[PDB]
Amino acid sequence: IRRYTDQRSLDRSFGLVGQSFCAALHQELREYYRLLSVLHSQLRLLVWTYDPKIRLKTLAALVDHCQGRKGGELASAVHAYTKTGDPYMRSLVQHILSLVSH
Amino acid sequence: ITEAALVRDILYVFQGIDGKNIKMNNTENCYKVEGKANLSRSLRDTAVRLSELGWLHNKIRRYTDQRSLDRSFGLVGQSFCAALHQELREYYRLLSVLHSQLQLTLRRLLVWTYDPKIRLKTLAALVDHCQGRKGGELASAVHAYTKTGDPYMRSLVQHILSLVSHPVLSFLYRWIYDGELEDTYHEFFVASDPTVKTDRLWHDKYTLRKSMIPSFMTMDQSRKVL
Amino acid sequence: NLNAVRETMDVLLEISRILNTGLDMETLSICVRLCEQGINPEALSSVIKELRKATEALK
Amino acid sequence: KSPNVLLQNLCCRILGRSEADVAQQFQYAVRVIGSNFAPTVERDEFLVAEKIKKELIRQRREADAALFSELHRKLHSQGVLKNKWSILYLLLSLSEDPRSYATLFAQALPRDAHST
Amino acid sequence: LPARNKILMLSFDLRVGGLGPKADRLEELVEELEAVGSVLDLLVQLAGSGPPRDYFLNNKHVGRNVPYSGYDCDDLSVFEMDVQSLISREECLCHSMIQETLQVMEAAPGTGLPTVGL
Amino acid sequence: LQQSLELKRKMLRDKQNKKNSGQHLPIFPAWVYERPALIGDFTALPIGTLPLASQESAVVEDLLYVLVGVDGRYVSAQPLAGRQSRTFLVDPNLDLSIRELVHRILPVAASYSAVTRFIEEKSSFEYGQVNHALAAAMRTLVKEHLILVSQLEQLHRQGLLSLQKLWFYIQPAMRTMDILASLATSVDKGECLGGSTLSLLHDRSFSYTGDSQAQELCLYLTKAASAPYFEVLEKWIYRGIIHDPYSEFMVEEHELRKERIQEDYNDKYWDQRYTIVQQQIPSFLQKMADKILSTGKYLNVVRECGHDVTCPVAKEIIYTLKERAYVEQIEKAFNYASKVLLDFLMEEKELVAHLRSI
Amino acid sequence: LVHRILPVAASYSAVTRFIEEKSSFEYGQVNHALAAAMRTLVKEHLILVSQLEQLHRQGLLSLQKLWFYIQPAMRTMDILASLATSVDKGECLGGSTLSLLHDRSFSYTGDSQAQELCLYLTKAASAPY
Fold this sequence. Notes:
The structure is cut from a larger assembly and holds 3 copies of chain A, 1 copy of chain C, 1 copy of chain E and 2 copies of chain F.
Chain A: H1 2-7, H2 18-42, H3 46-65, H4 87-93, H5 97-101
Chain C: H1 2-17, H2 25-37, H3 41-58
Chain F: H1 4-18, H2 30-34, H3 52-67, E1 75-77, E2 88-90, H4 96-105, H5 107-121, H6 128-157, H7 163-189, H8 196-207, H9 213-238, E3 251-253, H10 268-271, E4 274-276, H11 289-303, H12 326-347, H13 351-357
Antiparallel strand pairs in F: 1-2, 3-4
Protein name (chain C): Mitotic-spindle organizing protein 1
Subcellular location (chain C): Cytoplasm, Cytoskeleton, Microtubule organizing center, Centrosome; Cytoplasm, Cytoskeleton, Spindle
Family (chain C): Belongs to the MOZART1 family.
């Protein structure tokens, strides 16, 4: 996810909806850096590392589903990818869908 | 050598006063560092960076150091030098405040500078360009530095030019109201012709001298007051 | 006057926000409707201070 | 007493109009006395004593100037008043002349000797 | 004791702790609050018992003109508090994130699952 | 470095000759440009043979100095010190894990050196008031970066800053510096000054609309840059007289009376003496571009034939995001100028009697 | 820095000698009034240095602060010292040292700090005349 979102910030043929998608992904990346800050200060912690091992999966899945898009097909691969009943993913899509629709 | 010495030395270098870990005072045309500790940027780069504040101090004080013994500079140049006494007074005030708070690196004193070196940057041109200007040729040489694009700088020399334009608002208050002006250093544009006292008075004894007109008066404005 | 009571309701919001009261917009609407009757406010102090207390007693 | 409630007492003393009569002067008062509420210059009672001497020279009375010194001895003898600079500076500011320059005069130091 | 005076007595207490223009807005508010009265008497009993940059502050490079006010250069230390409040929030967060999970890594067993309490 | 001093003098002669109220257009002295000790952009062992938990700390201190342009100890600024770009060489003996992270933190360092050199070199007089203001509002963010690294030094003394913490802390300002350095490179590439880098800012403000971290920055920089332009516009709209000491304005003033005189045998005063420039328009005045010229030209041809009049009202307005206050003011002064010219024309030396007697 | 601050002490010995020698009856009525209002300027310097002494006693003064405080009075003493040298050198007395004051009040107008000094000395010295 860090590779793709930095690659498309050197792209301007990715549209301006792709740039909103990418801005959202930067902000999602920020919280995973928050975790790795906390952990670096302490330098088995499975329980620490179990909760983002679910979270990063769904984000990279969202990135992979929206492979090579711009415009209303990226608002029909980020809004057409909200058809779950999993409330942990429902929370994840808001803070991405909100930026994309703007 | 220790770092706690460096801050009090460079403090003096701001004032131009000799240090102890730096024995230069713009003697080699600039300040260089004597004494090492193998710090290549925290004893060398920072110190040389901050010593040019003192170089600028040497310049701005150097001009005043001669003009205050110069009694033939006008009274508009000796008001320019009186706004240039204030610009040393304020420098001393800043140094006074920082000196008490030093009682140790402070990002090598770069918190307290970088807004310093905007006034010094402007006065480095006012103390290079104005050299041999007295009278109204100086009130156009501070009026060309008030076209600056930075809002800080335009109001900076609108302060200096507010001070400088006080004798010229008293020369203009007595070529009009008294109607006769008299100065032994020509800062005003009346060029009187000696032994004209007869009925060639209405024709002669007034010629618009064109090295003493300020630039807040265009030519026509000076053509009427005559 | 119907335009005026809306503006006075909106100017009333800030001094209940910046004084660190327990009120937001909903409690302001309830309490402004209660005060229009003639009910004493020094008593309403206690019911607001206890509604905010009784939830913390459960935790 | 706390200052904000104290100023309406002040205005009931000066005006003949109650605290439920006027709130406009109290609005001007809360604007001016607050945000100028910390001493921005230095404070010491010795200086304001040497300026009450300077006022009494302007009255051309030197007999009251030599009793004011024994009053200033008394002020040191009791030593129970919190700020002695302020009240003398205020009564000095409100002085009346029974009938000049200040660019050679000094004032209090501007807290440019202050440190954090 | 009037209604608009009780807002003024807290404008003063605004002015003591800095924040001049906030009190300057409050006094623009007090003239329309009384040139509803029973609500503000409820606001003074709840006063402090509830639940808990800008490019026009210390810059002079913006503006069509600026007023010249000389060197001050002692408000650059309270531009560091302008940042210090941010970085002291982002380290208080890391103290309440290491605590809530070391309290679950280390505790008496049987307290992290209530079904083991049966 | 060597190249800029040429360009400055060649540009300086042009605006000095062109405008007759812009005479003796000055320059700052040479030492202001030459020595790099007037900006922030200026024991010792190979750290790789050392233990690991000292390497990171040494690199954190050096890199924190590097960010504000002070060239570090184990990070050297590679010798070019020209264009709006710089490169650095960290030690190779350094452990691979630490060095890789250093590379990830390094874009903001290049993106500082580029910014500060712009702020010195392109604030000179030939670039004009708008480029001066753009540099002066870039400078406040540079000041903020300085403010940051002072407090972070105290954190590193307390055993509280790591390289992972350092990267984390510098992330919000990295984007800001990135925007500033890209803008400076663009201004260099098109040789944009005056209004050609007031259209660039106007496009950039629309460009970011999905991030809103960068959009507010761009809005601030164009608010800063549009203040000197609107002064000249205010003069031109309420009068027919401008000063324009360095060329930034769409209207230019020519001087001809050598061919036609005492009468206009073609109306040269009223047609082409005041002409338009299509390359100094800020591209939000482009919709009004004809109307701007007409608004002041009509004042010239009424104040010359014998008349005196001033502004309807004074409004000092600036750039607003996606929004326009100036359209209304330009229209209201335009109709007013046409009205005063028409009233004067139809009564004083009236056209009606002229046409009757034809 | 001590070298730079020493001329206000030279310009204290200079200022104090005139007030003693030029108040007597061998220099006319105007020199009495002039020297008796030059004394006031010494009095206010004493006022200043008491203020400095208190803060210095509490361990709070420094040489840098002292310099900033004394600079305006350094200008004041310098004006008085130059004037005293000129009054002695031309043997100025009577109305010949009311021409000098008249000239010096005209000379400065650049800050009006020195102008106020000379206007004060003239208003005090012109009373007997």
